[PDB]
Design a protein around this ligand. Structure first.
Ligand SMILES: [Ca+2]
Lengths: 223, 56
């Protein structure tokens, strides 16, 4: 997260870290046994870390659980990034508390202009590298589809939405993928891609979660 | 050596944080960089050995 602020400890209880030796992606807990992330975050072996604040220090509130099943959307495209969404079933249900909680799936697609919250442990600089110990937060609005398409000519599909600022300065970055974009208490987006980070005329592009609610529910009920 | 070995490391548009190896012509050795997770270029290796063999 570039241009954000350190989240209040445990104010984002649904945020999880995907770890395979080191933190490589984020995710969101949607129920006691399932996590939603980005398909490009796929790894054969993944450990999910919940209740995290400082990713590099054992705090005592964390729960470490291995992924039992990893399911990518069957129509995910590695080149266009269309349908960049993935479900992870945990080996065992996690204990829900004040530090570990679920986020609700969208009731409908949120309109452009809706203020949202983006979070993650990704890079904090547009030029250079600075990985934070503490979870970062960013308040940003859903952008009109027209501006998204104008920023990324011919690269935006109906399953994507831009979130951020056309002037740049604030944006998600490497290490934030798979992370949540929460608006009014609902998961409306998943950190996916963009050209660089926080650059003018290139806001981050996110997976539009409202188009996958049925696929998510049907997949969970079948596995 | 191959031309792609002289190209700078390409992070790509994806936002994952994946450590990969690339040949640093300037230093004449393979080092690590952060790969985004998609649309990798050829000067991107999963191991130092593969990097040295291909671009050494
Ligand atoms: Ca910790």
């Amino acid at each position: 997260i570039v241009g954000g602020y350190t989240c209040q400890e445990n104010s984002v209880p649904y945020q999880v870290s995907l770890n395979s030796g080191y933190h490589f992606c984020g995710g969101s807990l949607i129920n006691d046994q399932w996590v939603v992330s980005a398909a490009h975050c796929y790894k054969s072996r993944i450990q999910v870390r919940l209740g995290e604040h400082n990713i590099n220090v054992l705090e005592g509130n964390e729960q470490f659980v291995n992924a039992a099943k990893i399911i990518k959307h069957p129509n995910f495209d590695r080149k266009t990034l269309n349908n960049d969404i993935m479900l992870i079933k945990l080996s065992s249900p996690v204990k829900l508390n004040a530090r570990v909680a679920t986020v609700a799936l969208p009731s409908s697609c949120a309109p452009a202009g809706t203020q949202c919250l983006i979070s993650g442990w990704g890079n904090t600089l547009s030029s250079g590298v600075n990985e934070p110990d503490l979870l970062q937060c960013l308040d940003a609005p859903l952008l009109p589809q027209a501006d998204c398409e104008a920023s990324y000519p011919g690269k935006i599909t109906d399953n994507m939405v831009c979130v951020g600022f056309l002037e740049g300065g604030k944006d998600s970055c490497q290490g934030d993928a798979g992370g949540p974009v929460v608006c009014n208490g609902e998961l409306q987006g998943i950190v996916s891609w963009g050209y660089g980070c926080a650059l003018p005329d290139n806001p981050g592009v996110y997976t539009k979660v409202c188009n996958y609610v049925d696929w998510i529910q049907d997949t969970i009920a079948a596995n | 050596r191959p031309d792609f070995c002289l190209e700078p490391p390409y992070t790509g548009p994806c936002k994952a944080r994946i450590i990969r190896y690339f040949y640093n012509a300037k230093a004449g050795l393979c080092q690590t960089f952060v790969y985004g997770g998609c649309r990798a270029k050829r000067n991107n290796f999963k191991s130092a050995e593969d990097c040295m063999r291909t671009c050494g």
